[PDB]
């Protein structure tokens, strides 16, 4: 019987990109985001634009 699927929160490789609005956390953490309805989510992808 398959018990359950679990993630893996090992830190990835930091890779250099060069552009302007991009951030990367180097230890544990998340960014806090809000939808236009009002719920709160937590993310780790750091591609941002205006």
């Amino acid at each position: 019987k398959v018990a359950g699927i679990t993630q893996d929160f090992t830190d990835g490789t930091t890779t250099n990109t060069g552009r302007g609005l991009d951030v990367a956390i180097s230890q544990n953490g998340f960014f806090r985001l809000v939808d236009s309805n009002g719920s709160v989510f937590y993310s780790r992808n750091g591609q941002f634009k205006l």
Partner: protein, 51 residues
């Protein structure tokens, strides 16, 4: 990986653009030459990141 090689390729191009600029402007009358300087990058880990 691929990222360190592509950063080295990208940083060895301004180091030729600023020498081609001096080679071109070595005949004018009020010019001051230029140069570039590099510096390594590092994340939290111990392996390097590029240039």
């Amino acid at each position: 990986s691929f990222s360190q090689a592509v950063s080295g390729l990208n940083a060895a191009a301004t180091n030729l653009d600023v020498i081609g600029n001096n080679i071109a402007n070595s005949a004018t009358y009020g010019f001051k030459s230029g140069t570039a300087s590099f510096a390594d990058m590092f994340a939290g880990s111990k392996v390097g990141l590029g240039v």
